[PDB]
Structure 1
Amino acid sequence: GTEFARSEGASALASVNPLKTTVEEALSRGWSVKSGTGTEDATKKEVPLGVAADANKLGTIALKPDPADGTADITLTFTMGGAGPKNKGKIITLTRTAADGLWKCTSDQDEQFIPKGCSR
């Protein structure tokens, strides 16, 4: 009844949306992106995303493939394991298609709580 269901979705998307820039900046250097926190690794030429998996207590952030070099589709997911009953277990997926470099957002939330710019 009183779950903050719209704000949960907005918060989840706000945790992953800024990582699009992080990914693009690494790929433009010809470096790979890897999950988690840490320093750039000049031996393997990997840049970490810079955010902990649990930075937002609504859920968990994941990257696939890990590491990612831009020659395959990339997905960033926010899995809402920490949310209330309407959104628990739902997943927001950002996909960067390697063929064209374009990003899409899909969600399996109930349509009324899907954030702006994302589709089913």
Structure 2
Amino acid sequence: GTEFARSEGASALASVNPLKTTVEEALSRGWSVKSGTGTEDATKKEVPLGVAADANKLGTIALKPDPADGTADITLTFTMGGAGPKNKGKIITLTRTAADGLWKCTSDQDEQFIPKGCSR
């Protein structure tokens, strides 16, 4: 009853939303994106997302496929394994469809805690 359920959802989305830019900039160069931290790899032409999987203690960030080259749908997920009771186990998913390059946000949280712009 005292859990910060609405702020948890906003913090989670704020950890993955900025990565859309990172992904688009890499694909515009014809480079692939790979998860984790590190330096660009000029041999394989892969750019890391630049954020650790556990950057936000509310949960974990994941990329699929990994690496991703733009020719298949890409998903960025924030799994709230560190959240309070109402949001623990819930997942915010950002999907970039390869056929049109568009992004969508879906969440399996209770409707009242889904961040603005995301749907069930």
Answer yes or no: same fold by TM over 0.5.
yes
Once the two structures are TM-superposed, the CA of residue 25 in structure 1 deviates from its matched residue by: 0.1
Q: Which consecutive segments of 4 or more residues in structure 1 shift more than 6 A? A: none
Distance in 2, matches of 1:30 and 1:107, equals 30
Distance in 2, matches of 1:7 and 1:48, equals 28
Secondary structure of the corresponding residue to residue 38 of structure 2? coil
Once the two structures are TM-superposed, the CA of residue 16 in structure 1 deviates from its matched residue by: 0.0
Distance in 2, matches of 1:112 and 1:100, equals 30
TM-score (norm 2): 1.00
Distance in 2, matches of 1:114 and 1:17, equals 14
Identity of aligned residues (%): 100
Distance in 1, matches of 2:101 and 2:67, equals 17
Once the two structures are TM-superposed, the CA of residue 87 in structure 1 deviates from its matched residue by: 0.0
Once the two structures are TM-superposed, the CA of residue 105 in structure 1 deviates from its matched residue by: 0.1
Q: Given the alignment of the two structures, is residue 80 of structure 1 paired with residue 80 of structure 2, yes or no?
A: yes
Deviations 1:85-117 (A, max 9, x none): 000000000000000000000000000000000
Once the two structures are TM-superposed, the CA of residue 7 in structure 1 deviates from its matched residue by: 0.1
Q: What is residue 107 of structure 2 aligned with on the other side?
A: 107
Once the two structures are TM-superposed, the CA of residue 83 in structure 1 deviates from its matched residue by: 0.0
Distance in 2, matches of 1:26 and 1:98, equals 14
Distance in 1, matches of 2:116 and 2:15, equals 14
Distance in 2, matches of 1:52 and 1:2, equals 29
Alignment root-mean-square deviation, CA: 0.1
Deviations 1:52-108 (A, max 9, x none): 000000000000000000000000000000000000000000000000000000000
TM-score (norm 1): 1.00
Distance in 2, matches of 1:77 and 1:56, equals 13
Report how many residues are paired: 120
Distance in 2, matches of 1:94 and 1:76, equals 5
Once the two structures are TM-superposed, the CA of residue 24 in structure 1 deviates from its matched residue by: 0.0
Distance in 1, matches of 2:40 and 2:25, equals 13
